[PDB]
Amino acid sequence: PKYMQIIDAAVEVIAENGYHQSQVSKIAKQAGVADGTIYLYFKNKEDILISLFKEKMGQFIERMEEDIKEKATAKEKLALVISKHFSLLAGDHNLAIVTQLELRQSNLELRQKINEILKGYLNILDGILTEGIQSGEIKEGLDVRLARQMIFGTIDETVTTWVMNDQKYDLVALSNSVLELLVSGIHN
Amino acid sequence: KRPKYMQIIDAAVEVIAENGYHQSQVSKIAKQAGVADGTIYLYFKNKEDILISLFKEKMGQFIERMEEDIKEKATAKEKLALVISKHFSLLAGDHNLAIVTQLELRQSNLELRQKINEILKGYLNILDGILTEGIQSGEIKEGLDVRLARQMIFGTIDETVTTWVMNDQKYDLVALSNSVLELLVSGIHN
Ligand SMILES: CCCCCCCCCCCCCCCCCC(=O)SCCNC(=O)CCNC(=O)[C@H](O)C(C)(C)COP(=O)(O)OP(=O)(O)OC[C@H]1O[C@@H](n2cnc3c(N)ncnc32)[C@H](O)[C@@H]1OP(=O)(O)O
């Protein structure tokens, strides 16, 4: 529909120009819709940014949630999380620019709305960690919140570095090396 | 004169933290420092010059102090323990600093970001030094991807701070130093 056409054109425009520099009129023209047609679907530019993130994250979570059911151990569940995270962003370079640079807004009001959407993804990491402790696979007395922040922070930094290096190298191929580091640490 | 230069730097930290980088005009920084707009322009080209120099100055001082301190530590674990505790302590000691590092320095403009990341190299090279020495010591096992390990360490420390800033500093960040250390050292597996 026209809705997804605007969403996709927004991903391209925001990635290319930056969020604040982006023009709603330009997003419309690239989507192939009239200027007024965008406002039938979105309140403003902020609504566009939040909705595209909510949408894509919403798709990513529901795929992830059912996919990790097939995997028994916490290590296997985390392996899939990392490879899927890396795979989605490697498949479309515009997406990585949005996630690593453009969604990193400093305005408290806007950033809280962004981080609210992030919560669903981090919740999956929490579940993997809590059930891992239950089985005795994951360290007992380990802080789930801190481990969640290590896992996400590590994955995120790997992506950011890749983005800053013009995405010239294979991000997906780093999946297993990242997993082992998070599993056994630097001492190993 | 450097004292005036650094006075502007310190005034800018407060302004950028309290106002946000977008609303951090030269005139506001001037008013904070208690100097005329012209005085600022004798030391800096513009708002962007101040932000980069701000980061260069404070990171430089952090690195120098860090290089100094870790000389007293023996193992890579102890060296990393110190890096983590000092990183947390600096940002916990002045919340204005943490706002600048976790939010305000996170610029979307690729050209500005590249200049910021250039200053970040010196910090990451200390982590590289700790790891490469650790491999050549037997403390860290062979075949460790240094780059990825560095990215893991910084990413973990950085995300822990950001979460703390986003939760309005409502917990003891420095007290988490050892827990973060053990997670990086031993991982999540039992
Ligand atoms: C208030 C005042 C401030 C107080 C400050 C004092 C307090 C200090 C503590 C606070 C610190 C917090 C920092 C503040 C915020 C900074 C900005 C952020 O957002 S930070 C958070 C976000 N993070 C960031 O923004 C940091 C993102 N990272 C970077 O931008 C860069 O890694 C770099 C510039 C940091 C280093 O660059 P470089 O020296 O070049 O090293 P590279 O490894 O990148 O590249 C080497 C070559 O190898 C290739 N290669 C690399 N990796 C891999 C791999 N895994 N597999 C295969 N290949 C790989 C690569 O293609 C390249 O190839 P080529 O070019 O030779 O062909």
Ligand SMILES: CCCCCCCCCCCCCCCCCC(=O)SCCNC(=O)CCNC(=O)[C@H](O)C(C)(C)COP(=O)(O)OP(=O)(O)OC[C@H]1O[C@@H](n2cnc3c(N)ncnc32)[C@H](O)[C@@H]1OP(=O)(O)O
């Ligand atoms: C466009 C395409 C999209 C692609 C599709 C997506 C799939 C692939 C992409 C992957 C996603 C990439 C993300 C891209 C978006 C960029 C956004 C970033 O900047 S991300 C990079 C930067 N990262 C960020 O910006 C994320 C920063 N984190 C946060 O802002 C939050 O953790 C949260 C909102 C995520 C969750 O919040 P919440 O659910 O509230 O859970 P909390 O634990 O935080 O709070 C619970 C309570 O516990 C307290 N407490 C916490 N720790 C401790 C402790 N150690 N001791 C004692 N107490 C502690 C705390 O004070 C709080 O107090 P209260 O509530 O009782 O008063």
